[PDB]
Amino acid sequence: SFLLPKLTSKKEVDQAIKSTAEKVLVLRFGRDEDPVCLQLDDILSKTSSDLSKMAAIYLVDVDQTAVYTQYFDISYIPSTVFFFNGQHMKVDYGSPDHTKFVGSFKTKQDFIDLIEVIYRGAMRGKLIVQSPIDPKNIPKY
Ligand SMILES: OC[C@H]1O[C@@](CO)(O[C@H]2O[C@H](CO)[C@@H](O)[C@H](O)[C@H]2O)[C@@H](O)[C@@H]1O
């Protein structure tokens, strides 16, 4: 749906990691009212439907649960994490941190292209993939 599911506890995140099968699990750690989160959530919402065969997207409330925030070394929101069949996926964006995407995507198409790459690699058994996004479009922060 356009109004993506919210996860508000550790147990709910645990469960989404386990329950999302054969698709990229997208976990957006943020706050729904935060300006950069608003930007990113618009892209996640608007692309969710046409990505529905490849990805399941969730909005994770960092103000109601924080176990995972420490686990992924999240200092800035939004931070977006990718999983496939229960295992964390890394992506090389051209920055040192491959474990999470920090900030918002420049365009819808960048997110789409990224998911395509993650999905294909994950389906081939890979755990780390190369981002297809032009570095000029990667938030620098
Ligand atoms: O240890 C350096 C060696 O690691 C590779 C991945 O095998 O890339 C990593 O190190 C680069 C240089 O520090 C980083 O820019 C990159 O993000 C990181 O994955 C090699 O390409 C590199 O030679």
Swiss-Prot record:
- The membrane spanning regions, by residue number, are none
UniProt xrefs under SMART domains: DIM1
Enumerate the subcellular locations listed in this protein's record, separating them with semicolons.
Nucleus
* Keyword Cell cycle included in the entry's annotation: yes
Q: Which UniProt keywords apply?
A: Cell cycle, mRNA processing, mRNA splicing, Nucleus
Q: Name one GO biological process term.
A: mRNA splicing, via spliceosome
Coarse class of the primary localization is nucleus
For the keyword NAD, the answer is no
Q: Which GO terms describe its cellular component?
A: cytosol; nucleoplasm; spliceosomal complex; U4/U6 x U5 tri-snRNP complex; U5 snRNP
PANTHER family linked to this entry? THIOREDOXIN-LIKE PROTEIN 4B, THIOREDOXIN-LIKE PROTEN 4A, 4B
Member of which family? Belongs to the DIM1 family.
This molecule's function is given as: Essential role in pre-mRNA splicing. Required in cell cycle progression for S/G(2) transition.
Its quaternary structure? Homodimer. Interacts with the U5-102 kDa protein subunit of the spliceosome.
Q: What is this protein called?
A: Thioredoxin-like protein 4B
Organism whose genome encodes this protein: Homo sapiens (Human)
